[PDB]
């Protein structure tokens, strides 16, 4: 997208979202990132929404094909492998944008935490499909990214901040589903929920709605896990 203006790429990403054209939306936002300027809060959200939709469809397809493969010529494995390779390619693309150079140029806590949460998520999606020599290393990469995000978030954000809350939610999912640490997942989700609940009194009506929506998700996991 090198010949398109940054502002036009951002405008088109917004149009692509309204049209439910998430692959286009991701390509527009990748082009925007590659212009080399830092991203605003709204632009970070467009980038994240685009790729979460793309990889979400791939993950759902991969789970369907993997289930069929587990229940049973080479066609099912071949097709599962092609969807898997495509999913890994998208994750690698996102990780490459974060490494060149979104994270290193992100100095305030809001931006850096956002990108490190992304990094943990995309390594987590790689871990979901990993089986071999690098499954352990991929899991550690996800852990390290989430942990650094958590350390900054606890130092620099209030406990009701929605990015801090979503980070803790996803890290708890990492512990439960990837790292075989359900007790760590439960402890993290409970502590996060309780510390947020104690801070709600400081919030406006609108912020209260933002925070409680994510706190509910923590609760729904705790209900499924306990």
């Amino acid at each position: 997208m090198g010949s398109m203006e940054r502002a036009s790429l951002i405008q088109k990403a917004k149009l692509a979202e309204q049209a439910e054209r998430y692959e286009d939306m991701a390509a527009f936002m990748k082009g925007a990132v590659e212009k080399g300027e830092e991203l605003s809060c709204e632009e970070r959200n467009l980038l994240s929404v685009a790729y979460k939709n793309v990889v979400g469809g791939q993950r759902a397809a991969w789970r369907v094909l993997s289930s069929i493969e587990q229940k049973s010529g080479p066609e099912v494995r071949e097709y599962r492998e092609k969807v898997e390779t495509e999913l890994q390619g998208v994750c690698d693309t996102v990780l490459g944008l974060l490494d060149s150079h979104l994270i290193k140029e992100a100095g305030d806590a809001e931006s850096r935490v956002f990108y490190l949460k992304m990094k943990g998520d995309y390594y987590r999606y790689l871990a979901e499909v990993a089986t071999g020599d690098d499954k352990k290393r991929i899991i550690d990469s996800a852990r390290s990214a989430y942990q650094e995000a958590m350390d900054i978030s606890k130092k620099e954000m209030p406990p009701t901040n929605p990015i801090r809350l979503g980070l803790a939610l996803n890290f708890s999912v990492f512990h439960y589903e990837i790292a075989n640490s359900p007790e760590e997942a439960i402890s993290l989700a409970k502590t996060t929920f309780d510390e947020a609940m104690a801070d709600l009194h400081t919030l406006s009506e609108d912020s209260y709605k933002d925070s409680t929506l994510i706190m509910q998700l923590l609760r729904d996991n705790l209900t499924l896990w306990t």
Partner: peptide, 8 residues
């Protein structure tokens, strides 16, 4: 489940 994260 994780953050849905699929709507801006």
């Amino acid at each position: 489940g994780s953050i849905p994260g699929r709507r801006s």
